[PDB]
A paper describes a structure:
Human MRP5 was demonstrated to play a critical function in regulating cellular cyclic GMP (cGMP) homeostasis, which is essential for many physiological processes, including the maintenance of vascular smooth muscle tone and cardiac contractility. hMRP5 also influences signaling transduction pathways and may contribute to drug resistance in anticancer and antivirus therapy.
To capture the nucleotide-bound form of hMRP5, we mutated the catalytic glutamate E1355 within the Walker B motif to a glutamine (EQ). The structural comparison confirmed the ATP-bound hMRP5 adopted an outward-open conformation, resembling ATP-bound states of bovine MRP1 (bMRP1) instead of human SUR1 (hSUR1)42. The two NBDs were bridged by two ATP molecules in a typical “head-to-tail” configuration. Importantly, the curvature of the transmembrane helices formed an elongated cavity across the TM region with a large volume ~4540 Å3 open to the extracellular side. A thorough analysis of the ATP-bound EM map revealed that no extra EM density was observed in the transport pathway and the remaining regions of hMRP5, supporting that the auto-inhibitory C46-S64 peptide must dissociate from the binding pocket and the whole N-terminal region became very flexible. Notably, the unique kink in the middle of TM5 disappeared as TM5 became a straight helix, reminiscent of the kinked TM4 and TM10 of ABCB143, which were re-arranged to a straighter conformation during the apo to ATP-bound transition.
Author numbering: 94 to 500, 572 to 785, 834 to 893, 909 to 1430
The structure:
Amino acid sequence: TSKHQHPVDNAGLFSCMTFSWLSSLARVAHKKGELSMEDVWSLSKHESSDVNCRRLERLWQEELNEVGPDAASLRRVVWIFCRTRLILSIVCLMITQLAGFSGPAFMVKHLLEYTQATESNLQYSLLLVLGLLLTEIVRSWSLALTWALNYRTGVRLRGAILTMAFKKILKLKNIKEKSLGELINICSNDGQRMFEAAAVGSLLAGGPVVAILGMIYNVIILGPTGFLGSAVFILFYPAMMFASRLTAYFRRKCVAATDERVQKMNEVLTYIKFIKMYAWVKAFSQSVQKIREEERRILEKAGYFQSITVGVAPIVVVIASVVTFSVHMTLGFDLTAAQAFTVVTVFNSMTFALKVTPFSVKSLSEASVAVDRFKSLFLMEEVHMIKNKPASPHIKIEMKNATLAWDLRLQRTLHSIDLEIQEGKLVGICGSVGSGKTSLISAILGQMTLLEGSIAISGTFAYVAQQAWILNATLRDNILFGKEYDEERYNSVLNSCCLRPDLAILPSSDLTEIGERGANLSGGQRQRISLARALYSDRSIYILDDPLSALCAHVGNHIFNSAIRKHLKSKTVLFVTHQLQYLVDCDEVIFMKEGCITERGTHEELMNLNGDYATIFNNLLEEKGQGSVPWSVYGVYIQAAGGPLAFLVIMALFMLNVGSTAFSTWWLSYWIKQGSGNTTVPHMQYYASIYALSMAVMLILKAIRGVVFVKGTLRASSRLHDELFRRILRSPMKFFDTTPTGRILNRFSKDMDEVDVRLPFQAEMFIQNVILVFFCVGMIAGVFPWFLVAVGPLVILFSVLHIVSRVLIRELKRLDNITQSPFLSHITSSIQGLATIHAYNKGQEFLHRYQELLDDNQAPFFLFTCAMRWLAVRLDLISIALITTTGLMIVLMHGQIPPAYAGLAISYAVQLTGLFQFTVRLASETEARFTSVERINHYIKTLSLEAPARIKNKAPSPDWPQEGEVTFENAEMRYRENLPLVLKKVSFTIKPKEKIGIVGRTGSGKSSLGMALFRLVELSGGCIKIDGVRISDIGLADLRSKLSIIPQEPVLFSGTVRSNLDPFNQYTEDQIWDALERTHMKECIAQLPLKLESEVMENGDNFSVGERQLLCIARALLRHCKILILDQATAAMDTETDLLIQETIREAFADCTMLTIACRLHTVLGSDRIMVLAQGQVVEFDTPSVLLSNDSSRFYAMFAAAE
Ligand SMILES: Nc1ncnc2c1ncn2[C@@H]1O[C@H](COP(=O)(O)OP(=O)(O)OP(=O)(O)O)[C@@H](O)[C@H]1O
Ligand SMILES: Nc1ncnc2c1ncn2[C@@H]1O[C@H](COP(=O)(O)OP(=O)(O)OP(=O)(O)O)[C@@H](O)[C@H]1O
Ligand SMILES: [Mg+2]
Ligand SMILES: [Mg+2]
């Protein structure tokens, strides 16, 4: 072991069958008033996701491969895995039923006979009391054993199924196509559903075993009454199956409706920096409110039928028995003299066992659709590393007339591709936005669908993507990627990528936290980190997807001359490019167009055959609470919309119902104390009719109260969620930067499952229990008020026990809820990088971390239920001992105590006891469960808030955007409130109608002049004004729409391109077509049947960045803002299209004030003025002509060094 004793799996002597191992933790629970992480007794090797998972996998694979897998019914999840553990429960249920039935029924009759004439004997009670004690002890022990077995056996199934699902998730999928938000919802919600169905769905078998016993007892006491019970039970059978059939469809529709809502919830989380400038927070709010309203309506419709089956009529049996008694009544019956109320009380006690059937049937019906869903997840294509084609030696990559394109129902893009690569050679492709030299790179990975051709490959890859993927670990761990530390190789890597000043500028040291996805670094730094990791990993084959795009000229030249030329000269490097500056030193160049290779060979041969591109080459052109749950959460919960009125109506209805049932009980009790037939006999029929109509009322009343309660609780939940969403949406940027996303999404997946499912039932049950107890104590105080002595000791000991167990219950629940968020964080952050993870073949480490996190989360689940079972056992034992003592008292005190004042003693007692036993358990249950509302309230207004959309008090005149005067003055920022300054002493004065180009060294600042305008930075020093009007005083909502920005990284939401094009439908139909046509996409849209309703998702995955950039250009063209700024709009674009692009930009915004950003000097030479910055400061600047004839100018030096 060496970790924890875990006394469950040993100590076979009389120490572990009863719940006694938890007495050790009860001391520590109240000694410190807490329970930390070091004394939780983590799970042993028995309940570990390493032994059961293998067995489940083997069983499922065998059941798949035995015959053709058409559907397989997924019967092996439940019926064959947890089978042997259910036979013991189903065989102990019969024992406990018989023990609870046979004993008391005869004992009460014998005690009544003894209280009739005690004067006969005195020692005849000892056998009776001994039998009573034996039966009670046997019953309680059997019940505790059954619950313990089911609780223990309900965990392993979920523990194995979760890891099976994740292991299936980690596979090569060409596209998601699964509404990614669904996958997370599959991991959490369906985890819970597979648990309850294994721990509750086992008491359904307890119905018939007692029904047959009741029928045979009735036929043995009365002759011809053995036929009506069977007839009235046959009619009861199909109602349950009808209920299940009706609820299955409702559950399926509800889960389908809630599938989509959580997907749109993820889109804002990972794109908040994008939709924070165009005030697109309005459409999404309306869309999510509409889908939430639809979900709430269907949930209410589903739940209305349930409230009618929480025991609307378990009195069918008593109604049938009363009808049989009244109809057959021959005015005396010649048999009913002493045991009149005994049989009625026994039959009333029968409802306790069968009151739990609806819960079992509902859980089974839900588990059916859960099984269907999990079956739907499997039976999909495992397309990865399958080619089934021969290879050849002395080569690494070989192709033979491949014909590939994105997704099986789309027009082919590549046809008849054939190429070869020699070992240790450098090859460049080059081309346009046509042939698409990104499908070729991904073809050999295995992510590309295949139709024909032949692909062969043998080796290892160090993949680099066009974008960047950065984990949450520290920088040194990111560079190492799970490798052994070194000193010489690490220093060589750091010196070979020109990374030294970047590491020196860090505040503390190299070891620093990065973030969720490298949100604290620029694009160039992320590219450099990815390149350094690929360089240090030391793999056989290097694949670079344009690693020299966003970076400058000098650093790129140095890296190519130092790293690629020398440090990587002993391996094979294959990379594509759009710039022909470095193609001189390359070995071979292969040119392909429109998916077809035209000419290939030595680069020196591409001079006279076709000088197409040569014209370009010619010259220049959390925290866990440490206290008890206060009443503030309850006050907030009841202060929801329509709270007090609904609560008062519900309480009044409940009080009236309890009064009615009390009056009926008194009526039947009085009727019991009457003549034994053959006297005063017509009134019986009238009384039966009165009783029948009374029941009716109660029923009607119970239906009404259920309806009202369901409506009120659902309204409260909807209002709470609607309040929460706006607060999360207006969260400042720093909160999103520090706190990971897995800490926010949890409150939207797990809390909403428990608040809207389990809470109302427990609340209503506790309310009913407390009103019944108060009525019983009032009645006891009413008649026979001379017995009010034991009440004090009873209440004080019960309070002592409750205050003893509540500490453990609360601490265990809090520790259970705390440790579930890193789970979701990891499962979210390990999906987006499927390509890189598959390339590096690093699934095992992620899987092991997943398993360890799952076990840590599952550790405190068992003890939470074990504590409640232990409390129930203690309460039952105490009550049994007290009633035994009171009965023995009776026994002894049977000579000089009249029976008139003692006949009802055992009666009222058993009720009182039972009522207290139920009350304590219900109170503990609700106190445990009411922590989710507090957890949601943890994000109350104490959290930071974004900035005030507007103000509506000092809005500027509508004619404000007239001049583009900008006056920068001392703009110094920190970006983290702790990090050192990134830009210092920035002051500019730009006259209206001016053009300025941006170019400079990597790192440093570029984009440098971003922020401090449309700013959300919490400016501390300096201030700027636009057109003579300050920026701090004016509101944000109006100001953000005045100017427009084209982001460097394209962003494309789901739905359609139109919705992005018009946030509010303020443009006609021809203007958008003209805008799309003007930028040379005449055939880029008409190629599809949809014209303006294109299906775009997942950041435009159909067409690559070459088209996403121009889509964003077209979108920003129609806005026509006062100031339109382009942030490096020529990242990956050809040279021929450049002119057209800049010509269109100049034609459109001829007089607008703009600041152009580009990575190429030759494409910025036309600007009126230029400026450059070295590290954090701007050097002297003027027109390009002035600085061109200046040897001592950095701009001329870098232009000359650009070659
Ligand atoms: N989101 C961020 N959070 C915190 N610090 C940041 C963030 N972005 C940049 N920095 C830091 O601010 C300083 C200036 O970087 P800046 O963003 O201006 O670079 P850049 O000009 O965009 O770079 P590149 O040319 O590589 O794209 C650097 O120290 C950088 O690490
Ligand atoms: N991420 C994607 N997922 C699915 N299909 C894609 C994706 N990107 C592009 N497509 C489809 O495949 C075709 C080929 O585009 P490809 O990705 O090869 O472009 P590219 O030339 O490399 O891009 P760029 O010029 O923007 O750098 C597109 O016209 C489109 O039909
Ligand atoms: Mg690419
Ligand atoms: Mg930038």
